[PDB]
C-alpha cells in the first residue's frame, strides 16, 4: 500500500536533531523549524529495500494550510512531545489525536514518544511540575495509546538510534499486521 510517515511537533522539541540523524547521519545543535517537506530513508524490511516517505511539518497553528495535506494514508505519526512536559502530551490528546483520527482513515495508527533519553530529568521535571503535573513514563504513553485505541506505542530516538530501526521496520510491517 502507499504508507506515509508523518512527523509533527512544536519547534525546538528535538524533531530536527533526530530527523537529521536518521535521514543523513548528523546531529545538528541548532533547531531549524521545518515548515513542510519530505525525506527518503532506506530501511530493510522483510529482506526488501523500502524507501520511507518521511513527511515533515512543524506543529504550530500557523502552518494549518500545508500540514493537513499529507496526513491522509499515514501508518505511523511521530507526534513529538516532551516526556518531561505533560502539557504537551495533554495537547496531543486534545488536538493531535483528533486530527490523526480525522485524516488517518482505514490505516493503522501508531503513537510515538520522543526524547526517551530525557525521560526522567529531575531539574526539568521539577521546573515543569511546579504547576502540579506528573511524570510521564513509557507505561503512561502506553496508557495514552490504549485510551485512544492506537495500534501500538513505539518509542524511538534517532539521537542515539534507540528504537528507530525496529520501530520503523514494524511500522512498515504494521500495514500487514493491522
Amino acid at each position: 500500500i502507499r504508507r506515509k510517515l508523518v512527523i509533527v511537533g512544536d519547534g525546538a522539541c528535538g524533531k530536527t536533531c533526530l530527523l537529521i540523524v536518521f535521514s543523513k547521519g548528523q546531529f545538528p545543535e541548532v533547531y531549524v523549524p521545518t515548515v513542510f517537506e519530505n525525506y527518503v530513508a532506506d530501511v530493510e524490511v522483510d529482506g526488501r529495500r523500502v524507501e520511507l516517505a518521511l513527511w515533515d511539518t512543524a506543529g504550530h497553528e500557523d502552518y494549518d494550510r500545508l500540514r493537513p495535506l499529507s496526513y491522509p494514508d499515514s501508518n505511523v505519526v511521530l507526534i513529538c512531545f516532551s516526556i518531561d512536559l505533560p502539557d504537551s502530551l495533554e495537547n496531543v490528546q486534545e488536538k493531535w489525536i483528533a486530527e490523526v483520527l480525522h485524516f488517518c482513515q482505514g490505516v493503522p495508527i501508531i503513537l510515538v514518544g520522543c526524547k526517551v533519553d530525557l525521560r526522567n530529568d529531575p531539574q526539568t521535571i521539577e521546573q515543569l511540575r511546579q504547576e502540579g503535573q506528573q511524570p510521564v513514563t513509557s507505561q503512561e504513553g502506553q496508557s495514552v495509546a490504549d485510551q485512544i485505541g492506537a495500534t501500538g506505542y513505539y518509542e524511538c530516538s534517532a539521537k542515539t538510534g534507540y528504537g528507530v530501526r525496529e520501530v520503523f521496520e514494524a511500522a512498515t510491517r504494521a500495514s500487514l499486521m493491522g
Binding site: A12, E37, N38, D62, E90
Partner: protein, 1492 residues
C-alpha cells in the same frame, strides 16, 4: 524594429541614445555603489518606461513627462516633500487648498525655472538616481518620504565637488549595507527579538510600536528632520549638504524616531473623528425636544420656548470642546499642532460663553418676574445665533476650524496638509449631484423625524410629566420614588427615541441613494425592458465602433470582415472552453462555408444575430451569460481605443502562498479498494456533465482544433493508462476547479487578445509576411511580449516540494513568456552572522541548469527577510521591483478572466486619463498652479459588473478593492499595498495623497473594528469637506455604527418596556375610542391613562421592524441563486456564547416579564425575533434528525463542562471562561470605569422597575406600613456569592485529608443548586406572584453582573485574593452557563420527540449549498452495545435533570396554591420582608368627587 525598446531606439528625434543612458546608470552605480544587478534591473525598468511613454508621444516629450511625474511636476511626490520639508510651505499649501475650495508663488516659480534649465541628460540622471534608490530601498519603500530624503542627500552628494574628486569607486552594495540596512534593522527590532540564536516574535500594544507610518511622518516636517542626530551626538543638520549622505550610515535611529499617533479607547476615536455627525444629530434633537415640552419649561411662555431651544447651540459647542480634548489626547504635545489645539480650544470656549450668556440672562427669575420685551427679543436673537452656530459647526471640518483667522506664526494645521489634506475636488455636475443628494437626505430625514416626534411624543410627554401616583413605597424612601415613576418611564422613552433618531438617517441615506441610482439608470437609458434581440442585433456595429481602433487606421477594408474575425476568435475561445456544442458554435460563427469567390458567399452573418427563437446557447451555460454580459457592456459608453503599437505597457501581478498549482493525478483518480465520499473526478463531472461528455464522446478537442482554422478564412488509473490522457485529465480538472493554473491561463488571455488585435488592425504586416505563418506568429508574439508582462510572486519556491517544483516547471514550459519572482537564501561569509537573503526573477527563456533549477535573470540582495510582518503586502513588495510598464493590475491568488474582457483592456487603461490628453510643458514660466489641469491624477481604478427591483437591490449591495493601479503614482507614494501588519487602507492613502479613484462598468473580474482606531480614519473625518465627509462616513463606518445602535436600541427598549410594564401593571388605566372626544371626563374617576405609552411601544416596534427589514434586504439579495421563488453542540454554543446569546437570553427574560405583566401584539414580534436570534445556529446546523446524535452531543457538552476540573483541558468550560478573562485582560483606568458605568445604569433601571412593582399603588395608604424590597434584592444578590465563598473556603481548609475531579464538580453543582435555591427563595418572598418575582430575578442577575464587572476592573489595576475573586466569578459563570444550556436542551426536546423530522432535514439539505452526504463506518457488536448503553445512561440523566428543573418550577406553584399565604411577626426595622399583603384591592375609582 529588432530592438528591445523599439519606440525610443528607432526614433531619430530621441535626445539621448541608449548607450548614454547605460553610461549614466553605470556612472551612478560607480559613485554610489548600487548593486550591479539592481542597476541592470532598473535600467531595464527605465527603458521600458521610456518605450511605453514614447509610444504615444514624442521622445523628448516622453522624457519630460517622466521627469515631471517623478520629481519635477506638481504631481511628483518629491516636489511635494521638498516644499513640505526643505521650503517649509505646508501652511501655505493649506492656504491655497482652502482658497481653491518669500512666498509660495515665488518659490514655485523659482522651482519651475530651475527645472526648465535642465538639459535632457540631467533629467535622465535625476530619474535614474531615483529609480536606483527606489529599487534598493526594500522595506523603506513603504516609507516613501524617507526614500525622498535619502534621494535628496544622494543628489547633494553627487553634485558636490567632493564626490567628483574621488577616483576610487564606492564598493558594490555600499548603499544597501550602509543606509537602508540600519533602517531595516530598526523596523525589525521594533517587532521581533532574538532568543538562543533563534528569531522570536515579540508582541506589544500598537500604541507602543513605531510602525512604518510613524517612521515616515518624521520626514514630513522640518522639525522632524531636525531631530536626527548622529551617534557622536552632533545634529545631522549642522553638516553641510555634501557631507550628509556619507554620514547617513553613522546615524542611530532608535532614539531619533518616535510615535506620532497614539491610540486609546474606541469611543474617544468615535467622538473625535466623527464629531460633525454627533453635533448635528444631538443638537437638532435637543432643539426638537425643547420646542415640544411646554411643561418642562413652563412654571406650574413664548420667550421660554425660544430661549430653551437656543441651548442646542450650547450643546454643539460642548460636543466640539469634548472632541477637541480627545484630539489633544491623541497626538503628542511636542509634535507640531499642539499649540493649534490650545488655540482652537480657547476659541471654542469663547463661543460657548457667547452662547451661554444671553440664555443665562433670560433664565434669571427676577427678569422673568417683570416681563420685558427686551428679554423676548434677546431670546429670539439668541435662538437664531444658536441655529447659526449649529450650521457652522456641522459644516466646517474640525481640522483648522479657526485657522484662517489666526494667521499664526507657528504651524497652523495639526496634520501636514500636503500629505493628509489634498483631496481631489469633484468637478462639474458631479459635485452638484453630491450636494443635492446629501441635501435631499437631510431634508427628508429632518421632516420625517419631526413628524414622528410630534405625533408619538406630544401626548406621552404631557401625561407622564403631569401625572402623580399613589403608593406606600419602600421603608427607607417609600414616598420619594412613586411620585417620580412616570417621570422615569418618560426619561427612558426619550432616550430610546434619541437612539432611534440616528438609525433614521442611515435608512434615508439608503433610500435616497437607491432613488439617485434609478435616476442615473434612466439618464443612461439602459433598460431591462429593452429587448435583448435589439442589443444583440446592434452588437456587431458596437464592436466595430469600440473594440477596434478603426478611425486611426486607414479605411481600406469593409468593417464586416474585421468584426467577423473578432467574433470568430471569441467563439473559438468559447468552443475551446467546451462550454458550447459544435452545432451551436457553428450557428454562432460567421460562416465562410459558401464559395469565397463571391464576396457575399465569402462572409455570412451568424444565424444567431440574424434570427433574433432557437436554442442558440445551451441552457445554463457560462458561455451564454458571458456573451450576454459582453453585449450589455458594449451597450454602455466606453472610451475610444488606440492602436496596439501606441498602447501603453502594463503588468499583471499575482502573489500566492501554498496554493495548488495544478491538479494532481492522485486527486483525480484514487485506489479501488477504498470508500469515501464520491470520487472528485466524478463530483466535477456531476457539476458540469454535458461539458465533460461532449469533448470525450465527440472528440471535440481535435474537431475544435480543426475548426479554429475554419479554412483559414477567419497503473495509477484503472480506466486508462496513457500519459497524454493523464495530462489532459489534469488540465481539465485544473481548469474546472480552483487552481493557480486557471488564473495563469485566464490572464495569458491578455496576450492572446493583444496578438489578435494587432493581427486584425494591421493587415499590412500580414501582406508583408505573405504566407509565412511562422514568421507572422513570431512578430505578433514580439509585440505581445513587448506590450504585456505577467508577473507572479512565489516566496515559497526555495522550499518547494518535488511535485510543486514539477508543477512550476510545467507552468513555465506552457507559457515561456511568463515571469516568476521568488526568494532564495545563502549563508554568510563570516561565522556567527545572519543569513543573506536575495530576491530573484525567472521566466521561461532562462536556460535550465544541470541540477534542474532555472537560472535567475536578476538577483537583488535584501538586508533581511522581506516578510517582516505576516501579510500579503510584503509578499507583493519584495517582488514588485520587477514590475514593468506604466500600469499595474492586482489580483489575488485565484481569479478568472476571459478573452472578451481582455479585448477591452485598451479602453480600461484609457480611463486613467493619460493616453488621450494633449501634452504641454509643465515648467512654462507663465503657467500657474490654479490654471493647471493635471493636479489630481487617477491613482486607482476599480472594476465592477421584478427584474428592475432586483437590479436596484444588486446595486444597493454593490455600492461601497483596487483592481488597477497607476504604477508611477502609487510607486512614488508609499507602496502598492500598505497593510503593514488591506486594500481599503491603500485606497484611503491614495485619496489622502491627492489622487482620484474611478470605477468602470465595462470590465468585470471574479474573485472566490480595528479600523476605527486607524490614523487614516481620523484624518479623513477631521479634514474632509462636509459632503465628502458624509459620503465617506455613511459608506464605510456607518454600517458598523448602525448595527451597534440597533443592538443598543434593542437593549434600551427592553429596559423601557420593563419599566413601562411595571407601571401599567401596578396602576389602573383607562381607554378611549377615536370617535369619543379627545378631551372629556375620564371614564373611571381618578384614573391615569397610560394608553398612549403602550401606543408608543407599538410605534417603536414598527420602527425597529422597518429598520431591521431594510438592514436585512442586502443579505437576502446576496442569495440570488435561490431567487424570488425560494457538528459539536458545545463548540457551537461557545462560539456564539457572548455573541448575543447571553444578551439574547437576558432580553428574552425581560421580554417574558413584560409579556406576563402586560400583553401587546408588538411583543409577539419581539418574541419571534429573539427566538430566531437564539435558535438560528441550532436550526441551520446539520445532523439534527437523530436522537442518538442529540445524546452524543449532550454527552460531549457534559464532558465539556466536566473537563478541566482536575486536569486542565483546552476544550473545556474552564478553558473558555479563562479565555474570556484573558480577552478582557491610571487614565486608562478612568476609561475602564467609563465602560462599567452603563452596566450600572441598566442595573439601576431594572432595580427601579422592581421597586415600582412592590410599591403597593392602589392599596389604601397605611401609616408606617412599608415593604423592604431593596433588602430583598440585597439578600438575594449577596447570598449566592456568600455561599460560593463559604464552600470555597470549606474545600480549601476542610476535609482535604480524607481523599477517598469529583470534588470540583461537586463545588460547581453546589453553586448551581444555591443559585436555584435563591431564585426559589425570591419566588417565595414575592408571595408566589410570578411577575414581581420575574422582575426581581432580572434585577438580581443585573446586580451580580455589575459586581463581577467591578471586581474585574479592580483586578486590572494580594495575589491570592485576586485569584480567589477570579475563581468566584468563574463559579457564577458556570452556574449561568449550565442553566442556559439546560434550558436550551429543554427547547431541543420537542424536536427529538417527533418520530420523524426527515422532511425538515431534507428541506434544509436542499437549502444548504454544499449538499453533501456522509455515512458512519461499521462497528463491532460489543462496541455497539456499549454505545447503546451510553445512550440509555445519558438520555436517562438528561431526563432526570429536566424533571428536576420542571419540578423546581411547577412544584412550588402547586405548594403555594395548596397552602394559603400568611405573613406575621416582622420587627426590628425589617417590616414585611415577605411581601406584605395576601389580599389587596388595588382599585381606587369613583368615590364621587374625592379620589383615593
Amino acid at each position: 524594429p529588432n530592438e528591445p525598446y523599439p519606440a525610443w531606439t528607432a526614433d531619430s528625434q530621441s535626445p539621448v541614445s541608449i548607450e548614454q543612458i547605460e553610461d549614466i546608470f553605470i556612472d551612478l552605480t560607480n559613485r554610489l555603489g548600487f548593486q550591479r544587478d539592481s542597476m541592470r534591473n532598473m535600467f531595464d525598468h527605465f527603458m521600458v518606461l521610456l518605450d511605453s511613454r514614447s509610444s504615444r508621444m514624442s521622445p523628448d516629450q516622453a522624457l519630460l513627462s517622466l521627469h515631471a511625474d517623478y520629481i519635477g511636476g506638481d504631481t511628483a511626490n518629491y516636489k511635494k516633500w521638498y516644499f513640505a520639508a526643505q521650503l517649509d510651505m505646508d501652511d501655505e499649501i493649506g492656504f491655497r487648498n482652502m482658497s481653491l475650495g518669500n512666498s509660495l508663488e515665488a518659490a514655485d516659480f523659482r522651482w519651475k525655472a530651475k527645472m526648465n534649465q535642465l538639459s535632457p541628460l540631467e533629467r535622465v540622471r535625476h530619474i535614474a538616481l531615483y529609480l536606483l534608490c527606489w529599487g534598493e530601498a526594500n522595506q523603506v519603500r513603504f516609507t516613501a518620504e524617507c526614500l525622498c530624503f535619502i534621494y535628496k542627500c544622494a543628489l547633494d552628494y553627487l553634485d558636490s565637488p567632493l564626490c567628483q574628486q574621488r577616483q576610487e569607486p564606492m564598493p558594490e552594495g555600499d548603499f544597501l549595507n550602509r543606509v537602508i540596512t540600519p533602517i531595516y534593522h530598526f523596523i525589525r527590532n521594533q517587532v521581533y527579538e532574538i532568543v538562543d540564536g533563534r528569531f522570536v516574535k515579540r508582541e506589544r500594544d500598537h500604541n507602543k510600536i513605531v510602525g512604518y507610518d510613524d517612521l515616515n511622518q518624521l520626514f514630513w516636517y522640518p522639525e522632524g528632520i531636525a531631530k536626527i542626530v548622529l551617534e557622536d551626538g552632533t545634529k545631522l543638520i549642522e553638516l553641510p549638504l555634501e557631507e550628509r549622505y556619507l554620514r547617513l550610515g553613522d546615524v542611530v535611529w532608535d532614539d531619533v524616531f518616535f510615535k506620532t499617533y497614539k491610540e486609546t479607547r474606541t469611543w474617544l476615536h468615535l467622538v473625535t473623528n466623527f464629531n460633525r455627525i454627533w453635533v448635528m444629530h444631538i443638537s437638532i434633537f435637543w432643539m426638537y425636544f425643547a420646542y415640544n415640552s411646554p411643561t418642562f419649561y413652563t412654571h406650574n411662555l413664548a420667550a421660554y420656548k425660544w430661549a430653551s431651544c437656543a441651548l442646542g447651540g450650547t450643546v454643539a459647542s460642548l460636543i466640539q470642546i469634548v472632541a477637541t480634548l480627545c484630539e489633544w489626547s491623541f497626538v503628542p504635545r511636542k509634535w507640531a499642532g499642539a499649540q493649534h489645539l490650545s488655540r482652537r480650544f480657547w476659541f471654542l470656549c469663547i463661543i460657548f460663553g457667547i452662547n451661554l450668556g444671553p440664555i443665562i440672562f433670560v433664565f434669571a427669575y427676577d427678569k422673568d418676574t417683570v416681563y420685558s420685551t427686551a428679554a423676548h427679543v434677546v431670546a429670539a436673537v439668541m435662538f437664531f445665533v444658536a441655529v447659526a452656530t449649529i450650521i457652522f459647526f456641522s459644516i466646517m471640518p474640525l481640522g483648522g476650524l479657526f485657522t484662517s483667522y489666526m494667521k499664526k506664526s507657528t504651524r497652523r494645521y495639526v496634520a501636514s496638509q500636503t500629505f493628509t489634506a489634498a483631496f481631489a475636488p469633484l468637478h462639474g455636475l458631479d459635485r452638484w449631484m453630491s450636494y443635492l443628494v446629501w441635501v435631499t437626505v437631510f431634508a427628508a430625514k429632518y421632516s420625517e423625524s419631526y413628524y414622528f416626534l410630534v405625533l408619538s411624543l406630544r401626548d406621552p410627554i404631557r401625561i407622564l410629566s403631569t401625572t402623580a401616583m399613589r403608593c406606600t413605597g419602600e421603608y427607607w424612601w417609600g414616598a420619594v420614588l412613586c411620585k417620580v415613576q412616570p417621570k422615569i418611564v418618560l426619561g427612558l422613552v426619550i432616550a430610546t427615541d434619541f437612539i432611534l433618531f440616528f438609525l433614521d438617517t442611515y435608512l434615508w441615506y439608503i433610500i435616497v441613494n437607491t432613488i439617485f441610482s434609478v435616476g442615473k439608470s434612466f439618464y443612461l437609458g439602459i433598460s431591462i425592458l429593452t429587448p435583448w434581440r435589439n442589443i444583440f442585433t446592434r452588437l456587431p456595429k458596437r464592436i466595430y465602433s469600440k473594440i477596434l481602433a478603426t478611425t486611426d487606421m486607414e479605411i481600406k477594408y469593409k468593417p464586416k470582415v474585421l468584426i467577423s474575425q473578432v467574433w470568430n476568435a471569441i467563439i473559438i475561445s468559447m468552443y475551446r472552453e467546451h462550454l458550447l456544442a459544435i452545432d451551436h458554435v457553428q450557428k454562432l460563427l460567421y460562416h465562410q462555408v459558401p464559395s469565397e469567390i463571391e464576396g457575399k458567399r465569402t462572409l455570412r452573418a451568424p444565424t444567431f444575430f440574424v434570427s433574433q427563437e432557437t436554442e442558440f446557447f445551451p441552457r445554463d451555460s457560462e458561455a451564454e451569460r458571458r456573451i450576454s454580459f459582453f453585449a450589455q457592456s458594449l451597450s454602455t459608453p466606453i472610451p475610444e481605443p488606440l492602436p496596439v503599437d501606441n498602447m501603453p505597457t502594463f503588468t499583471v501581478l499575482t502573489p500566492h502562498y501554498a496554493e495548488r498549482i495544478l491538479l494532481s493525478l492522485r486527486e483525480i483518480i484514487r485506489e479501488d479498494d477504498q470508500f469515501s465520499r464520491v470520487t472528485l473526478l466524478e463530483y466535477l463531472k456531476q457539476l458540469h456533465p454535458v461539458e465533460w461528455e461532449c469533448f470525450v464522446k465527440d472528440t471535440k478537442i481535435l474537431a475544435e482544433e480543426t475548426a479554429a482554422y475554419e479554412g483559414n478564412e477567419n497503473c495509477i488509473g484503472f480506466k486508462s493508462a496513457a500519459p497524454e490522457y493523464t495530462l489532459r485529465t489534469r488540465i481539465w480538472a485544473s481548469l474546472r476547479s480552483q487552481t493557480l493554473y486557471r488564473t495563469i491561463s485566464g490572464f495569458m488571455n491578455y496576450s492572446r487578445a493583444i496578438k489578435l488585435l494587432y493581427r486584425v488592425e494591421n493587415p499590412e504586416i500580414v501582406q508583408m509576411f505573405g504566407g509565412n505563418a511562422e514568421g507572422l506568429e513570431r512578430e505578433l508574439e514580439k509585440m505581445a511580449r513587448r506590450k504585456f508582462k505577467f508577473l507572479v510572486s512565489m516566496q515559497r519556491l526555495a522550499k518547494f516540494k518535488p511535485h510543486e517544483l514539477e508543477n512550476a516547471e510545467f507552468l513555465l514550459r506552457a507559457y515561456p513568456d511568463l515571469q516568476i519572482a521568488y526568494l532564495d537564501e545563502e549563508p554568510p561569509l563570516t561565522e556567527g552572522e545572519e543569513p543573506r537573503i536575495y530576491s530573484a526573477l525567472i521566466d521561461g527563456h532562462c536556460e535550465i541548469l544541470d541540477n534542474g533549477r532555472r537560472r535567475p535573470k536578476f538577483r537583488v540582495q535584501l538586508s533581511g527577510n522581506p516578510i517582516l510582518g505576516d501579510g500579503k503586502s510584503d509578499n507583493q513588495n519584495h517582488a514588485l521591483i520587477f514590475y514593468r510598464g506604466e500600469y499595474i493590475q492586482l489580483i489575488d491568488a485565484n481569479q478568472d478572466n476571459y478573452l472578451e474582457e481582455c479585448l477591452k483592456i485598451r479602453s480600461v487603461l484609457a480611463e486613467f486619463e493619460e493616453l488621450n490628453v494633449e501634452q504641454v510643458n509643465p515648467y512654462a514660466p507663465g503657467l500657474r498652479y490654479e490654471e493647471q489641469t493635471t493636479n489630481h491624477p487617477v491613482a486607482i481604478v476599480g472594476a465592477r459588473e421584478f427584474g428592475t427591483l432586483f437590479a436596484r437591490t444588486l446595486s444597493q449591495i454593490g455600492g461601497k478593492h483596487p483592481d488597477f493601479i497607476n504604477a508611477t503614482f502609487m510607486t512614488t507614494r508609499g507602496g502598492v499595498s500598505k497593510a503593514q501588519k488591506e486594500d481599503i487602507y491603500a485606497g484611503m492613502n491614495a485619496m489622502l495623497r491627492g489622487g482620484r479613484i474611478k470605477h468602470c462598468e465595462y470590465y468585470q473580474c471574479g474573485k472566490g473594528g480595528e479600523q476605527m482606531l486607524s490614523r487614516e480614519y481620523y484624518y479623513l473625518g477631521t479634514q474632509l469637506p462636509v459632503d465628502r465627509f458624509l459620503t465617506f462616513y455613511y459608506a464605510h463606518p456607518g454600517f458598523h455604527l448602525n448595527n451597534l445602535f440597533i443592538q443598543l436600541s434593542l437593549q434600551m427598549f427592553m429596559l423601557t418596556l420593563v419599566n413601562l410594564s411595571s407601571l401599567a401593571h401596578e396602576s389602573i388605566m383607562c381607554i378611549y375610542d377615536r370617535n369619543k372626544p379627545k378631551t372629556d371626563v375620564l371614564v373611571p374617576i381618578g384614573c391615569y391613562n397610560f394608553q398612549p405609552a403602550v401606543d408608543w411601544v407599538r410605534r417603536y416596534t414598527l420602527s425597529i421592524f422597518i429598520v431591521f427589514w431594510i438592514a436585512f434586504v442586502p443579505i437576502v439579495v446576496q442569495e440570488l441563486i435561490e431567487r424570488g421563488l425560494w457538528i459539536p453542540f458545545s463548540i457551537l454554543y461557545s462560539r456564539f456564547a457572548g455573541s448575543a446569546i447571553y444578551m439574547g437570553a437576558r432580553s428574552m427574560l425581560m421580554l417574558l416579564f413584560g409579556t406576563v405583566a402586560h400583553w401587546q401584539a408588538p411583543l409577539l414580534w419581539f418574541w419571534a425575533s429573539l427566538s430566531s436570534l437564539i435558535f438560528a445556529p441550532f436550526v441551520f446546523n446539520p445532523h439534527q434528525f437523530a436522537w442518538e446524535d442529540f445524546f452524543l452531543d449532550y454527552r460531549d457538552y457534559i464532558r465539556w463542562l466536566s473537563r478541566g476540573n482536575n486536569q486542565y483541558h483546552r476544550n473545556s468550560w474552564i478553558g473558555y471562561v479563562r479565555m474570556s478573562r484573558a480577552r478582557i485582560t491610571a487614565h486608562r483606568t478612568n476609561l475602564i470605569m467609563a465602560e462599567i458605568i452603563p452596566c450600572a445604569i441598566y442595573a439601576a433601571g431594572c432595580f427601579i422597575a422592581f421597586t415600582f412593582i412592590n410599591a403597593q399603588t392602589g392599596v389604601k395608604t397605611t401609616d408606617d406600613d412599608r415593604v423592604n424590597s431593596v433588602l430583598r434584592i440585597i439578600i438575594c444578590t449577596l447570598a449566592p456569592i456568600a455561599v460560593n465563598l463559604g464552600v470555597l473556603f470549606f474545600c480549601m481548609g476542610m476535609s482535604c485529608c480524607s481523599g477517598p475531579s469529583v470534588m470540583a464538580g461537586i463545588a460547581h453543582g453546589v453553586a448551581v443548586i444555591v443559585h436555584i435555591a435563591f431564585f426559589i427563595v425570591m419566588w417565595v418572598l414575592e408571595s408566589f406572584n410570578f411577575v414581581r418575582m420575574l422582575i426581581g430575578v432580572v434585577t438580581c442577575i443585573q446586580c451580580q453582573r455589575l459586581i463581577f464587572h467591578c471586581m474585574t476592573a479592580l483586578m486590572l489595576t494580594t495575589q491570592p485574593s485576586r485569584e480567589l475573586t477570579a475563581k468566584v466569578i468563574e463559579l457564577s459563570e458556570f452556574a449561568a452557563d449550565f442553566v442556559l444550556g439546560h434550558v436550551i436542551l429543554i427547547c431541543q426536546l420537542p424536536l427529538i420527540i417527533i418520530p420523524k423530522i426527515d422532511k425538515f432535514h431534507s428541506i434544509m439539505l436542499f437549502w444548504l449549498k454544499p449538499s453533501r452526504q456522509i455515512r458512519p463506518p461499521i462497528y463491532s457488536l460489543k462496541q455497539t452495545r456499549l454505545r447503546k448503553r451510553m445512550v440509555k445512561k445519558y438520555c436517562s440523566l438528561y431526563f432526570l435533570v429536566l424533571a428536576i428543573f420542571a419540578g423546581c418550577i411547577i412544584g412550588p406553584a402547586v405548594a403555594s396554591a395548596k397552602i394559603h399565604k400568611h405573613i406575621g411577626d416582622s420587627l426590628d426595622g425589617v417590616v414585611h420582608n415577605l411581601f406584605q399583603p395576601i389580599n389587596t384591592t388595588n382599585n381606587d375609582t369613583g368615590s364621587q368627587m374625592s379620589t383615593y
